[PDB]
Symmetry: none
Subunit: 664 residues, 2 copies
Amino acid sequence: DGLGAIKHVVILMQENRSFDHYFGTLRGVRGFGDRNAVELPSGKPVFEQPAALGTSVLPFPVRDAAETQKKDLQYIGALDHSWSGGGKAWAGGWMNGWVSAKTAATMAYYDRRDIPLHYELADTFTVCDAYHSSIHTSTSPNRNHLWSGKTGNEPNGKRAVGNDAYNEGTHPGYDWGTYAERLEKAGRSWRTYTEWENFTDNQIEFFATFKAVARKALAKTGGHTFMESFYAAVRDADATERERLFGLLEEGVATLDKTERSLFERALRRVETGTLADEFAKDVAAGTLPEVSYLVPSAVDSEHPSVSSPIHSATIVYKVLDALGKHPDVWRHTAVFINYDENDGFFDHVPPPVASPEVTEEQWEGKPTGLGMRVPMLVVSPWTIGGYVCSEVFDHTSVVRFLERWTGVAEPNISDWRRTVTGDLTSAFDFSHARRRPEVEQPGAIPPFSGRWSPKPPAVQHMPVQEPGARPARALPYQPDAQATVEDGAVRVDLSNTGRSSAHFALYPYAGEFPVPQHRDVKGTARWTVPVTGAAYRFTVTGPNGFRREFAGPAKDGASAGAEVASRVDARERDLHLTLRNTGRTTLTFTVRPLGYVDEADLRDWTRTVKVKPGRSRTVVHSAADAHGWYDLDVTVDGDDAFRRRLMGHIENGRASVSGHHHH
Amino acid sequence: DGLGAIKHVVILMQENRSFDHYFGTLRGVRGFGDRNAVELPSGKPVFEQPAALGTSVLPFPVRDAAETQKKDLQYIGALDHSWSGGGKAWAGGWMNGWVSAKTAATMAYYDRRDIPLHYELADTFTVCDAYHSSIHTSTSPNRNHLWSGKTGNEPNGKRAVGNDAYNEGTHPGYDWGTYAERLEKAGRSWRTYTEWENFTDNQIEFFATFKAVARKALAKTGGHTFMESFYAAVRDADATERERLFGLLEEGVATLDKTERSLFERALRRVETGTLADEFAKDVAAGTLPEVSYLVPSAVDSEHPSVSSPIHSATIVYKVLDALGKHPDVWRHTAVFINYDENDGFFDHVPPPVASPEVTEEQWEGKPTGLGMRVPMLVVSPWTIGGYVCSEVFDHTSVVRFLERWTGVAEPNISDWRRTVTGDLTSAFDFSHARRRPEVEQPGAIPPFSGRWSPKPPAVQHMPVQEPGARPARALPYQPDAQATVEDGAVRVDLSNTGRSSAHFALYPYAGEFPVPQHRDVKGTARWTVPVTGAAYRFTVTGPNGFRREFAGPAKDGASAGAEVASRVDARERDLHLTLRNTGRTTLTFTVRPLGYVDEADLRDWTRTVKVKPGRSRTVVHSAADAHGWYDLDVTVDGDDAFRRRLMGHIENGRASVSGH
Ligand SMILES: [Ca+2]
Ligand SMILES: [Ca+2]
């Protein structure tokens, strides 16, 4: 598994940016050109968000709005990022409440001219475009997953879905335990790198073991009971009062027992402001970088839109990666994960994989606590060079799962559902070939601050154009399929997935089959019974990595109900075997037409018309090998516009491939 | 001119090794024993590189570090090789930021016990010890120079001093010409020999013309737009997938017109992994070797320290030269240039000739873009046999200039400064006397890979010893001299060079005269004005091939104010005429003492003590003819501790000579 090449993992979680907000226009990721986008109940594509008075907001660039409103694109402000606001944007799974819940600024986005370091990093290393924040809400519950594998309950017994822990004087801290405490018990080295100001982002500080450590360490300081209280005083003190404060701290630190002292040194001692990267660089140069490093930048360095900016973040990212590259022998054995805690209130078009209501562990007030919106995740390391995309579903607990595989130290906090639906991040890596280490360009000057502002859409709206082209793609642990069978009052949808990992299916009803979209996780086989209440059915099933099955047609013994399409994927050949069946009394004529991945001067050789008589079946084999596994097929019956079957997907063979963007 | 005997030029450029890193111990080249080594501001020699807090790091052998750290000497890793890291190491021209910029591993070197084939080729053919990489940075800007004569600008208008072009799915490619496109239009034949994996070293692929041909030829491959994208899928594919992939490729290749098709075949079609020398040998055997061959090995064969090794490189170099030797008809009309793209971050002690700030075409962000660190260059041919050293200043564009002089196809991309300061590599050859193909030892077995590692300097440091002896040396197109006259508040330095090529002079200040070293290119005469603000001055001027002039003395009113030295070189006698004059009011006794090139038993007969009364002058004639034109003289005045004039160099006479050891 080649994980023995890793000696250091460095985790750098920035704040409050959604995937499309930054990378919707990036070549070769699931972005503004996504051909697996879901259609809203209004029939419009998810990108066309309902606004007030029957209007719509499309994604629009921050740069133009900044010019229009005469403001700086670096300093847009924050939007609602609350548990309730998220449920409103999410709208029961229909993903059409974004403008109402978040304002129209939710659709604003940056592109490569705006954030060139961000784009160059994705082009050089590996970017994850199915990486979700852990829960659709604010910072603290998301950071809980990264540090401990879950967000549990508040002391009042309610689910921890807000920032209540930030009242550090009155909150007693969370009691379900952190991963770093297990690393400590197992003898593995770790350290938090964090400055005097750290924007309540060092989540370990809110856990009960560490509150007890801080209180004892601070006992002599005149009343401070948690570190942020003490460091607020340090930040405001003159030189003389700082020396006094730090001398009183060190007297308290000397009273800690061996375990408390170690936890204090690794989680709670902050470095002077401005020196996070220099402190990290010093450990790199000394050969003392630990096995696991948490980098927790200050507010202004955090990328959070209320206190920071993209260029502030790019600046600290550069200094961290530069500090690493200054010592090649540490660089050759270090993986760096760069992600975001949540999406703020910024729109993203991918409906997240959610826990269905039967998964009570991951429901709160009738809403899923499981996988929020996509955020950018970049994996920077000697083993991820190449500009690859990795489309395996991950969340913040996937970082903990990486550490489980690497160190052997388990995190029992991760829920069974979450562990089933997310991966362990090992698929982003390729341990087999060395390359030269890329040089990363240093960011430009930080513009002078000229106030926060909120972008408003242009008067003339335009769909953004994603940078054209495909991207090399990592192999995925999925092999999904779905077939329909119309059966007396309902359609029986047979879901299958022969991959080594469970795959998430979502069903979107467009003929009143259900009131909201249905979600299911499948390893092996599973069955949806979709009740057809009228004369027709029309719904769409999505899955990972562009997988799509569309279903339309007539109901009981009513019209052309004889038509049956079955399918089987063959991984070794990357062939789709379509069994076309006639369950009726008339001699149907099927047509199979490519909708994509076939050069237009060529479709007729790949379009197939086949005649099937009553009680019989013909098999047509579609080869996707020329398209490296990608297929997009339309199956219809002549003289009938009710019946349709669309089949889109990528057949996996265990080897790297390309993304789906060479559709046209 | 003898260039008529050449029918084939073969260019094999390996990766990321500095000259001293490989040949600092080689007999008879400018290496670790270099008597013209520059002194650092600390007063230490350049080999003693400052580390932390008044400590330093001498060159140290990889082989010993490998015993200490229990690693394999073949598999040391790469160091920093960026434009800004190079600037820090070069340190404005003072050459004392190496350890800070690159880590102490920058001083690690190999010798004959470790890399015997490299040394044997130097002993057998011709080695160039003033061959520099074109620019002090990474691979791509240097390979730009070999393939195109320059590194121009990125699309954003910044100077292309980095590897931006390797982001091939986004970067649009470079817009100035390649030299190969000029050979093409001129009807000359050329071919690049490269495998499915070529480590982003086939520089022609990053020029817009070839990005366009690649995109067109890949149009039916289902998503690929640059060749490396397609071949990555080929390398991962089984035999059945491979046949489909090559079928998809050939469908697009069939759509190329006559000219695009020739470009594709000559620059873009890669051969199977492991068969580079085989496909080269096939062309040699069939009589179809082109006029110009670019050999671009795979990553594992490139010698690059992050993917390869010296023995991996020695293995492929030997196979290439063996293919040529197997066909004497082809060998006898073939010149092979073996060089390196850059020095990685490995130390080399020779400060490069750099463009001065006046030469704004070779400046970017206040740093010179012009001549990086020395790298090994070996010239293997019927006309370079005999173990010669050539010390004429060259860079990667000097290979292009050789092609100019041979094909008549000019490369206008080469800047005027580069044409002035570097030669055309004909000086490395002796076309009058072809000699028989010598045999060279085949490299041994490649050790199993045991991991990259970083050599650390030993606890007890030792300056390395260069192999003893001198080598035959090519005649050089320089004849430099420099002399000084003390004036009120300044020392005036008259530079001269009577050779047919411009000679590069550098001035190193050790008394505050300037904040950094100064650099001048001189054909004819030129003059420096060295400000003297204090009681004394001390500075050194270097020039090509061991040329040195040290000047030190009091500013005014000391025991030697009127001490003045002039010099005149005569090439026909290889004589140095020293004129010693007294422009003061006290009588002076000069001593002229050889510091080298005189038999220790004979030192006294060649030491001159001469009295020079005020307002008069006397002439000493130093005969360098028995030292093959080499001289190293110390001129002092009895009773003055400050005053010194050192004169060292080699008098050229148009004939092959010997090196300075
Ligand atoms: Ca946040
Ligand atoms: Ca290189």
